[PDB]
Design a protein around this nucleic acid. Structure first.
Lengths: 32, 430, 65
RNA sequence: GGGUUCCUCAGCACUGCUGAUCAGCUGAGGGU
RNA sequence: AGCCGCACGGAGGCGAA
RNA sequence: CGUGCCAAGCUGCGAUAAGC
């Protein structure tokens, strides 16, 4: 298995990704 | 002792021993698939709306897309895996995985490196002049986003890998190529139209429909090859019969392998241009974007639209070059990772019941003997095919199409082994 | 010298590949078809989605560039 | 005279003056 | 308009020729 | 004594062998 002392539930990575999208999706576009 | 400290700091994915319904593995996969497109589309935050064309060579294999939140794509992950297979391959760092140690060592380790290669590539990309404006400030910002997007994939892969079907990478690649096709041929600046319109305009352009053909031909070819196989195994004969062979290596053996060969070249054309407009011409003299001389030149796949005859020698080398790397990867993957002994035998024999006898010794020997054809060939061949698949040249990628088609079928199988395992809650190993 | 040897040998192994080969299964209009059908299917399936996302998301990047 | 009891692999409900992972036992292959 | 003996398995096949 | 995809018994059949 994995020696990853930390456990991360997928629901997070998904939501964290919805994060990158929103941030840059607006950080870039929607100028001004 | 090992890099266990930071290694234990690198997050992972919570694998539930609960009930993960087929319907859920499916629905999961799909969510990954889409987040993929979203990023692959979104542009990276960068005022310099002006970018120097594109690297028509890295995308495919790296199934990503330059200029987007995934401009680096699977590229790192592949790079990483490439090194590992290189070290743990040429014995340089001999390891007998058997024990959950070496196994989880080889892995965990590689994973880390993937994040290392995640940033490296990022920097290398911008440093290769993938965007044009090297505003130390803006440059930094970009790299951030870039490698971080690729990170998301590394974790999205993990998700699919433990919450859905097939594989992230495998998926991802097929995801890209498929799209690259449906869009290139039918999308906005779609080719089918540019051709169709060119017909209406009254000036039939054979160059607009061409690439579309290239893809059919490849697909048709690549599939045939993806068919090749052996045969039972018992006789039936045709018939049956009972017992239970019995396989016969083929193409998908050297899958991950060729993915690495092509990916190697990916990191050369990148690493050469990079270490070109940022140093001395170690690998080759690019100019014009790609390379027009040097190791780089001799190792640049010819595809795109139409096959290039105007350089025979160039062809020859590449081909042979690709073959070597292919075989190398195939070997470093069997040292390795190819039909073992333990599990093999352990399971084998079964079909317990009159129909009527069984098997035993001698069989293993015979198999092993008439099995040394794959590995070497499987790849040597594939690599050939893949390469020639590029001379011909096609939409989405002559070599990429080979992987996709395969990945897609190995993905169909996955969907079946599942549609069934969703009945008898036990035979999760037959 | 050794070069001669290895050359002599590969010729041998390769010949060993013979007795092994002479098998490959050409595809039958039936099978071949069915297959190539699923392949292209999944291909377009993975292509469309990328379209649905790409194309438009570029109509934007473009009308606001 | 017996007739596969020979060899191999897998087994232990039967047979074995107790037990058995063993077997002239049970099952499948092979062997002159 | 089903069938492949008693014999209801597995695989495969036959039947509007 | 054979004969069935796998076939030990029964039935059928006979190297055209549960059949032509």
């Amino acid at each position: 298995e994995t020696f990853s002392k930390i456990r991360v539930k997928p629901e997070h990575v998904i939501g964290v990704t919805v994060a990158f999208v929103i941030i840059e999706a607006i950080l870039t576009y929607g100028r001004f | 002792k090992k890099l266990i400290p930071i290694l234990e700091k690198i997050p992972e994915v919570e694998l539930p021993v609960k009930e993960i319904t087929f319907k859920e593995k499916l629905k999961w996969t799909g969510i990954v698939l889409v987040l993929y497109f979203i990023m692959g589309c979104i542009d990276v935050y960068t005022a310099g709306a002006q970018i120097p064309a594109i690297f028509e060579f890295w995308q495919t294999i790296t199934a990503s897309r330059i200029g987007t939140l995934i401009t680096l794509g699977i590229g790192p992950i592949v790079t990483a895996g490439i090194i590992m297979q290189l070290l743990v391959g040429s014995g340089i760092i001999q390891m007998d995985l058997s024990i959950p140690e070496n196994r989880a060592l080889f892995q965990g380790c590689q994973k880390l490196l993937s994040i290392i290669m995640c940033f490296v590539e990022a920097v290398l990309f911008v440093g290769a002049g993938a965007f044009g404006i090297l505003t130390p400030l803006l440059a930094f910002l970009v790299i951030i986003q870039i490698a971080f997007g690729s990170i998301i994939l590394i974790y999205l892969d993990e998700i699919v890998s433990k919450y859905g079907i097939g594989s992230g990478i495998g998926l991802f690649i097929a995801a890209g190529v498929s799209q690259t096709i449906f869009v290139g041929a039918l999308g906005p600046e779609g080719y089918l139209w540019k051709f169709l319109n060119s017909l209406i305009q009254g000036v039939p352009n054979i160059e607009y429909i061409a690439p579309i053909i290239g893809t059919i031909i490849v697909f048709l070819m690549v599939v045939y090859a993806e068919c090749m196989r052996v045969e039972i195994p018992l006789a039936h004969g045709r018939i049956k019969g009972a017992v239970g062979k019995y396989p016969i290596k083929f193409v998908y053996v050297s899958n991950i392998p060729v993915i690495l060969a092509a990916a190697l070249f990916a990191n050369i054309q990148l690493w050469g241009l990079a270490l070109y407009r940022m140093g001395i011409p170690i690998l080759g003299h690019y100019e014009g974007g790609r390379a027009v001389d040097g190791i780089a030149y001799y190792l640049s796949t010819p595809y795109g639209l139409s096959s290039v005859i105007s350089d025979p020698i160039h062809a020859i080398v590449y081909m042979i070059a690709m073959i070597i790397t292919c075989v190398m990867f195939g070997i470093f993957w069997v040292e390795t990772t190819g039909l073992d002994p333990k599990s093999m035998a352990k399971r084998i024999g079964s079909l317990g019941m009159a129909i009527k006898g069984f098997r035993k010794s001698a069989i293993e020997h015979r198999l092993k003997r008439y099995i040394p054809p794959l590995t070497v060939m499987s790849s040597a061949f594939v690599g050939f095919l893949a390469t020639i698949a590029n001379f011909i040249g096609a939409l989405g990628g002559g070599t990429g199409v080979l992987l996709t088609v395969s990945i897609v079928y190995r993905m169909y199988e996955q969907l079946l082994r599942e549609k069934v395992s969703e009945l008898h809650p036990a035979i999760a190993k037959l | 010298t050794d070069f001669n040897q290895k050359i002599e040998q590969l010729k041998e192994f390769i010949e060993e590949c013979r007795r092994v080969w002479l098998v490959l299964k050409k595809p039958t209009k039936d099978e071949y078809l069915a297959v190539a059908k699923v392949t292209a299917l999944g291909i377009s399936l993975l292509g469309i989605i990328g379209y649905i996302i790409h194309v438009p998301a570029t109509y934007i990047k473009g009308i606001l560039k």
